[PDB]
Design a protein around this ligand. Structure first.
Ligand SMILES: [Zn+2]
Lengths: 207, 88, 154, 68, 267, 403, 46, 48, 228, 61
RNA sequence: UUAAUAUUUGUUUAAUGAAAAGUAUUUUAUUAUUAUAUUGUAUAGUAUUAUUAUAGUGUAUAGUUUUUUAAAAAUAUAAAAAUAUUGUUAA
């Protein structure tokens, strides 16, 4: 709709009337260049439709694991010896896992200078250049948490990461810098509570 | 004390281009006499034997990593794991 | 002493009548095939951009046309290669304040690599036919492998 | 209460929600290989989505449910 | 009641032939407007079964399936042939999404246009076999593509009986023994068959037989009684048989020609 | 004394070099030697220009050797470097001086200028220092004062290229080298040989190697049909056969003169891609096939007997390459005679040899396992090597070691 | 305080479901029955 | 008793006790580190 | 090492390597294709003078036509990064592979790590409670705040613990010493300091700690009156 | 000793798996190259039964 | 007799929202190597792991506690809403 409206409002020089010819082949002449400018702008600068995703989609992605855990906890047959042992092992070594991910993170930030701000920027831009080689070689159980576990992230931030990954790279960086400035201003303004946050705190609902 | 000199406890500034320009690192340096007379490029990384003032422990740390980043000795910050460093 | 036509081997010349007209809802549904994205087009466009930067995309197409040795199907192919460079991080789009038009700029992160590319590339009748073939990688996404056959017709 | 152990075990072990379209299975394949922020995390091997027809032994051996 | 597949994305200038289906997602049911739902554990399981089944069908050109799986497989093969006749980039992306093997996707999109250029509909063919599966007493159906010998990578092949081994190429009628398969398909089939001759595979096979004997299935021989499937002498003999070829080129007479040169020692 | 000082200096230098992490190879016209052994099996972990690992993960005080570095060295065919056999006193002085110069050059200014995790080669017949096609930097031992200037003028782009080539070649995974060896196995299956490998390809060009691989894959059918028609499939060669191709092959009587191929007494088949054809290599294989397997069996028996002799007698054994090349297959009988003599007089050998170690009260660099090198005649060096000929007698060896 | 006998011959005599074990495993699947094959030994080896 | 059932000798088949084609599957797939040797540790330490 | 009578032809290390089950015509076709593609890639990387190209030249059409076969799939995409292949950002993977790392190009780290280790040394310094707290506040307001340098989570936890202990002991000391237009938040000795440090930590995006928020909650609790 | 042996074996296993993955990728690329050459020889364009005219029209893509 | 019955229905499959061990049995076979008394062997299964003698340069193609199929009724699943009802809080 918007493209049709603006392209019909553009009425500088329709002498050649070869819009279809220029759409199926090269241009007609260099003088009538307004249509060419508009076409190239709407083809490159204008973003692809439907690239932005909602946080409801990212929540529904993990809704599968949520439903699986709920069904298991509701209709779970008492586990056997090996399952009991695995559960006890995990419950006992959860603290060791937290300690070792903290040690990996502090070693990284002290020997390479990759601070949590840089780690969050890498998370949003979906770039692995901010991390050394051993980061991807870390154990898979902690490879995903050692990178983006310390810094705070929301479902909205994950959806924004997906939106960035879908959008082009220059637009990635520009929108990410804009959103980073916005988040810093939000952190500066977060001294007080808004009415919605007060209502949520009184109700007990956790976003 | 040497530890309180780097911070502003108690305008003009100059550039330090060698180990001799920094009087703090020159004291802890246990550099070998025959290898280098103190004309070590402070920006380049080179391994020299140090000797801390507190624990008096000898170790090997880079000159560029010692000045630019203020690396602490392994015994005073918890890597050598000596009785002075052990918790028990 | 001419260099005319970097066309495709299989594609024939199409005849569109003069009174042809698209519907208001059919003209915005045209899907073009993905043009070549290869090292040859990317390096040709990088060299043209290193010669002329920053410059409007129309000026870039005019410079590519003026260049004798050109490996490009059409302005659509140039737009696709520009999209690839934009996604890879070679070119960015900045909007001027006086003209309110966008402009391609070489990324200062990759300027040295662009210089090395143009140096390694720089260190009579011609006709180049482009031939493509689709395939799918191990991940399960479609992509076209391309090649160029050159010949001197007199 | 009458809930069959085997059937409830299968239902709670594996998924039931069916795909809706090929574009949707493509979007799911895109959004599946995503890192866990604070979850447990699972091994994403370099051949998880690649064709296992040559990897797994039983993907080519004679089968009765598929009839050779 | 409503199918969200009707919500069209990236609409083309011309309306689709189906315009309401996926068409690969079949929406299995029991009313005549839908496909016969073969018994599964969930609709997702049914879709996975259909996906693997159509993938294997495209791979080996035939599939013997029991129960209501045959009509579903036939209709899905018809839809795949329709996608191949379309030959659009979006159609290929959809088929690569739906299938397990992108190599089989490419094989289909390469061979099916020339194969079914001269056909309108009902491309596959289902034949109910009189022999039923022993474990279930369920009828079996042989589903294969019709145009086998006119244009396809498979041509002049015999399906009346299986080969000597399940990793050997299928039988070929003596009338058309001279034809050769495409090189990429041949190399892929060889890489697939090569895994059945390793020692680790036989180790895993004996372990699986031990697990079966422990579970209690009958007539399964002991792992210490099973035999290897392809020995070194059989491999050498079959390689000699396949490599024997005196066409268009003969050997160089090294003893008769002056190829030899002055070397260091030896005689 | 002075030799011992040179040896300890060289050991300190190579240890500091392996702590820095670079891979040092001395390339000669005949064969290359790996001097510095860094953590090659360790996967690259950091991209920083300066890495210092004082620990030695490959060699330990308990194991003293790793079962994987042997495979890594065999897969390239590199010989073991040793200062006591390097050569004359002036030559070993030059070598240890070059080692100390390189160590000091790294130590004074190590960093982005001279990056770590790089392969350095030392060549004698090299006009000027240049970068090889593989990615390793080769330097002429004659241009000693030019090493600093060359390494400091080498740009960061070429440094990064060399680092990348050394990381994906001969280090850790090495996928390019792995695919090259895979294609080598592919052509070796056609040749019905155990392993076909390229030698001298460390500091040389890769174009001839790639052309050889592609040409063999092109003309694979010719060799297969030829071996099928002439029954060239030998079980012993297929079980253990060694083919070694090089860019050039030099003669044993005249290094300037070049030969088409080379047949050794041990069974290896040496070819040069310069004057090799699908007919020439085929004719050589057909002429030497009924002889190479016999030579391999006899050499295997001799090497097993020598291994038993090294297990019993403390002395170590080696063979002279010059004499091995000059024998041209006749070395087998001489080696068998030497083995027979040693086996007949084995019981007294260790009893007489322990007396020397017991009577040498003070030595600059003593070793319990003194080296014996099978040669044509008697020789002697100030090292712990014997240079024992093939024709031996007990009293003769006694008087040759000590009156 | 109970014993488990998987498959034992009934009151009238051993059936095929137990003779299969007798010929494959070597004895009845319970182990409480001692393998006694004197008759077939006399019929074949003697 | 699977060994006595299959690998052992019977009046119908020969003994497979020493038979590589019947015993090779007994080896483990995933290799395991060697067990600690107390005699070797004693001869190595040589307590004083 | 092979006691078995039979032997297995292929090994686990080689599957699809020898290609024994391939027709010789297909074998030579694959070899010719690989050679043509390698020659085309080599010419593309280093253009020869005059373009001889005898291996990739074709004379079937009757005219001099040379097919420069462009390479494809040179970049490697693992299955863990299938999302980039499905989106279409293969150039992004190319850049992330051929681009220098960010920690090698960051120069503010040389200063931030130095200041962090100096803060750790100051914490380890054995000084009295109030004097050490004042010194830490001075050093912080002098060096970190005017440059928004990243502070480590454990250092923040330790300094807030010290500030809480100092606030408690100074409240006790003021009570013992006792034995207008002043805001309620000013009664606590380090309430505003803790607040500013916690907000700076939130802005610099360092993970807070349960002990951190516990000490801040106690500093909020030990307050005279109710404040919005 | 146990931990050292475990590390030494796991390093080899990891490198073997990585080499297997890389070799499989290279083999699939070789397969695509061979099928492209064969399609060039046989004159089969995998763009449907229509041909090159619809592609030149590039309406549907 | 109940009984043409009730509950079950398992041979690589839709492979799994996942993968680093110890201990006690059953079963045994010509392993190699360091190379000085005796003593108990390996894989494979089975049962168990709170009450510290199992957690690290980075984890076995791991799928029997995972189970077949061309109908309605009964029953189970409200994680089976694109319903409804009630109650709580908030504008
Ligand atoms: Zn100290």
């Amino acid at each position: 709709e918007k493209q049709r409206k603006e392209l019909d409002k553009i009425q500088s020089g329709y002498v050649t009337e070869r819009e279809l010819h220029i759409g199926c082949d090269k241009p007609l002449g260099g003088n009538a260049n307004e249509i060419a400018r508009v076409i190239d702008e709407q083809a490159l600068i204008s973003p692809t439709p439907g690239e932005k995703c909602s946080t409801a989609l990212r929540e529904l992605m993990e809704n599968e694991v949520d439903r699986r855990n709920h069904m298991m906890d509701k209709f779970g047959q008492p586990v056997g010896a090996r399952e009991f042992h695995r559960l006890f092992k995990e419950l006992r070594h959860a603290d060791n896992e937290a300690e070792t991910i903290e040690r990996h993170q502090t070693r990284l930030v002290e020997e390479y200078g990759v601070y949590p701000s840089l780690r969050l920027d890498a998370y949003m831009l979906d770039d692995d250049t901010y991390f050394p080689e051993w980061v991807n070689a870390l154990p898979y159980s902690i490879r995903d948490r050692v990178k983006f576990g310390s810094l705070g992230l929301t479902e909205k931030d994950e959806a924004l990461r997906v939106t960035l990954g879908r959008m082009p790279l220059d637009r990635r960086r520009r929108e990410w810098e804009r959103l980073k400035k916005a988040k810093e201003y939000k952190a500066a303004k977060e001294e007080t509570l808004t009415l919605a946050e007060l209502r949520d705190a009184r109700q007990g609902k956790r976003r | 004390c040497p530890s309180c000199e780097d911070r502003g406890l108690s305008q003009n500034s100059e550039l330090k281009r060698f180990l001799k320009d920094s009087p703090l690192l020159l004291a802890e340096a246990q550099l070998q006499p025959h290898e280098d007379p103190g004309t070590i490029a402070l920006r380049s990384n080179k391994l020299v034997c140090w000797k801390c003032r507190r624990c008096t422990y000898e170790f090997v740390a880079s000159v560029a990593d010692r000045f630019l980043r203020y690396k602490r000795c392994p015994q005073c910050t918890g890597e050598k794991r000596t009785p002075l460093n052990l918790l028990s | 002493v001419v260099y005319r036509g970097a066309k495709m081997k299989n594609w024939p010349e199409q005849r569109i009548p003069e009174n042809f007209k698209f519907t208001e809802e059919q003209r915005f549904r045209t899907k073009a095939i993905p043009r070549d994205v290869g090292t040859i087009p990317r390096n040709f466009v990088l060299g043209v951009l290193y010669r002329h930067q920053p410059c409007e995309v129309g000026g870039l197409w005019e410079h590519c046309t003026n260049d004798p040795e050109i490996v490009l199907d059409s302005k659509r192919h140039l737009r696709e290669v520009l999209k690839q460079a934009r996604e890879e991080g070679f070119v960015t789009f900045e909007r001027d304040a006086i003209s309110n038009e966008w402009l391609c700029f070489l990324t200062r992160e990759r300027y040295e690599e662009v210089q090395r590319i143009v140096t390694a590339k720089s260190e009579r009748f011609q006709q180049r036919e482009i031939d493509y073939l689709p395939y799918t990688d191990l991940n399960g996404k479609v992509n076209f492998m391309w090649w160029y056959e050159t010949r001197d017709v007199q | 209460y009458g809930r069959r152990y085997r059937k409830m075990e299968t239902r709670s072990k594996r998924r039931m929600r069916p795909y809706a379209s090929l574009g949707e299975i493509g979007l799911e394949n895109e959004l599946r290989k995503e890192p866990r922020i604070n979850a447990k995390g699972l091994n994403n091997t370099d051949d998880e989505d690649w064709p296992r027809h040559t990897k797994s032994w039983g993907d080519g051996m004679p089968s009765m449910r598929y009839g050779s | 009641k409503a199918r969200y597949a009707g919500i069209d994305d990236n609409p083309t200038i011309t309306y689709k032939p189906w315009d309401t289906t996926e068409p690969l997602m079949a929406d299995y049911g029991w009313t005549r407007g839908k496909l016969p739902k073969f018994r599964a554990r969930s609709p997702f399981h049914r879709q996975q079964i259909a996906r693997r089944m159509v993938t294997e069908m495209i791979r080996k050109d035939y599939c013997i399936v029991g129960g209501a799986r045959a009509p579903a497989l036939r209709i899905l093969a018809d839809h795949v042939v329709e996608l191949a006749k379309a030959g659009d980039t979006d159609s290929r992306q959809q088929l690569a999404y739906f299938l397990h093997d992108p190599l089989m996707v490419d094989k289909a999109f390469d061979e099916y246009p020339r194969r079914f250029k001269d056909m309108n509909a009902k491309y596959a063919m289902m034949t109910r076999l009189k022999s039923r599966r022993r474990t279930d007493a369920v009828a079996m159906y042989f589903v294969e593509y019709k145009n086998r010998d006119m244009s396809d990578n498979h041509k002049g092949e015999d399906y009346s009986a299986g080969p000597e081994r399940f990793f050997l190429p299928p039988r070929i009628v003596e009338t058309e023994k001279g034809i050769q398969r495409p090189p990429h398909m041949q190399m892929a089939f060889d890489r697939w068959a090569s895994k059945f001759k390793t020692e680790e595979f036989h180790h895993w096979w004996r372990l699986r037989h031990a697990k079966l004997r422990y579970w209690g299935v009958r007539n399964v021989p002991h792992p210490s009684d099973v035999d290897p499937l392809w020995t070194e002498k059989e491999e050498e003999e079959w390689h000699n048989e396949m490599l024997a070829n005196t066409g268009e080129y003969e050997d160089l007479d090294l003893d008769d020609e002056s190829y030899t040169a002055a070397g260091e020692g030896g005689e | 004394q002075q030799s011992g000082t040179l040896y300890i200096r060289g050991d300190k230098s190579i240890e500091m070099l392996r702590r820095f992490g670079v891979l040092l190879i001395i390339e000669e016209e005949g064969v290359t030697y790996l001097v510095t052994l860094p953590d090659v099996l360790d996967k690259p972990v950091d991209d920083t220009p300066s890495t210092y690992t004082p620990a030695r993960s490959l060699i330990g005080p308990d194991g003293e050797i790793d079962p994987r570095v042997q495979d890594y060295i065999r897969d390239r065919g590199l010989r073991a470097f040793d200062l006591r056999m390097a050569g004359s006193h002036s030559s070993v002085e030059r070598f240890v001086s070059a080692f100390e110069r390189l160590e000091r050059l790294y130590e004074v200014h190590r960093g982005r200028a001279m990056r770590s995790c790089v392969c350095l080669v030392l060549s004698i017949k090299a006009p000027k220092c240049y970068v090889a096609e593989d990615g390793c930097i080769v330097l002429s031992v004659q241009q000693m004062p030019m090493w600093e200037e060359f390494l400091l003028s080498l740009p960061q782009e070429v440094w990064q290229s060399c680092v990348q080539m050394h990381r994906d070649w001969r280090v850790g995974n090495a996928p390019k080298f792995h695919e090259q060896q895979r294609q080598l196995m592919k052509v070796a299956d056609m040749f019905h040989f155990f392993r076909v490998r390229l030698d001298g390809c460390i500091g040389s060009q890769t174009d001839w190697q790639q052309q050889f691989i592609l040409s063999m894959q092109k003309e694979e059918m010719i060799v297969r049909n030829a071996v099928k028609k002439y029954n060239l499939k030998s079980e012993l060669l297929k079980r253990r056969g060694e083919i070694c191709v090089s860019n050039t092959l030099r003669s044993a009587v005249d290094p300037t003169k070049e030969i088409g191929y080379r047949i050794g007494g041990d069974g290896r088949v040496y070819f040069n891609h310069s004057a090799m054809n699908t007919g020439q290599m085929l004719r050589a294989l057909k002429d030497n096939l009924r002889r190479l397997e016999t030579f391999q069996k006899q050499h295997d028996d001799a090497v097993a007997t020598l291994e038993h002799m090294s297990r019993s007698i403390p002395v170590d054994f080696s063979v002279d390459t010059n004499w091995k090349l000059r024998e041209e297959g006749n070395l087998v009988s001489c080696l068998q005679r030497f083995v027979r003599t040693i086996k007949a007089n084995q019981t007294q050998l260790s009893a007489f040899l322990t007396m020397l170690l017991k009577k040498r009260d003070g030595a600059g660099a003593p070793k319990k396992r003194m080296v014996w090198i099978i040669s044509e005649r008697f020789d002697t060096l100030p090292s712990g090597v014997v240079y024992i000929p093939w024709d031996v007698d007990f009293d003769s060896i006694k008087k040759h070691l000590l009156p | 305080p109970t014993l488990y006998l998987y498959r034992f011959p009934g009151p009238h005599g051993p059936g095929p479901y137990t003779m299969k074990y007798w010929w494959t495993l070597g004895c009845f699947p319970t182990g409480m029955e001692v393998p006694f094959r004197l008759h077939e030994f006399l019929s074949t080896y003697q | 008793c699977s060994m006595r059932v299959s690998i052992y000798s019977r009046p119908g088949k020969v003994s497979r006790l020493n038979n590589a084609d019947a015993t090779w599957h007994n080896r483990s797939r995933k290799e395991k580190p060697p067990d600690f040797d107390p005699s070797a540790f004693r001869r190595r330490y040589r307590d004083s | 090492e092979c006691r078995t009578s039979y032997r297995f032809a292929v090994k686990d290390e080689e599957r699809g390597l020898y290609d024994h089950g391939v027709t010789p015509d297909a074998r030579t076709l694959a070899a010719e294709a690989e050679a043509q593609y390698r020659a085309s890639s080599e010419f593309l990387h280093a253009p020869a003078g005059g373009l001889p190209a005898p291996e990739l030249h074709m004379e079937v059409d009757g005219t001099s036509v040379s097919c420069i076969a462009a390479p494809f799939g040179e970049e490697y995409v693992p299955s863990s990064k299938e999302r980039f292949a499905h989106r279409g950002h293969v150039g992004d993977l190319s850049r992330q592979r051929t681009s220098d790392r960010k920690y090698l190009l960051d120069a503010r780290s040389h200063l931030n790590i130095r200041k962090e280790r100096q803060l750790s040394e100051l914490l380890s310094a054995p000084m009295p409670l109030l004097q050490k707290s004042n010194e830490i506040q001075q050093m912080l307001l002098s060096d970190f705040y005017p440059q928004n340098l990243v502070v480590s989570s454990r250092n923040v936890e330790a300094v807030i613990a010290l500030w809480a202990q100092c606030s408690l002991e100074q409240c006790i000391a003021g009570l013992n010493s006792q034995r207008h237009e002043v805001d309620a938040v000013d009664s606590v000795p380090f309430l505003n300091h803790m607040k500013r440090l916690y907000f700076h930590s939130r802005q610099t995006h360092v993970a807070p700690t349960p002990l951190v928020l516990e000490y801040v909650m106690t500093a909020l609790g030990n307050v005279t009156t109710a404040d919005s | 000793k146990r931990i050292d042996t475990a590390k030494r074996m796991r390093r080899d296993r990891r490198r073997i798996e990585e080499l297997k993955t890389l070799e499989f990728w290279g083999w699939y690329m070789k397969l695509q190259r061979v099928r492209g050459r064969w399609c060039r020889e046989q004159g089969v364009s995998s763009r449907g039964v229509y041909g090159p005219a619809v592609d030149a029209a590039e309406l549907w893509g």
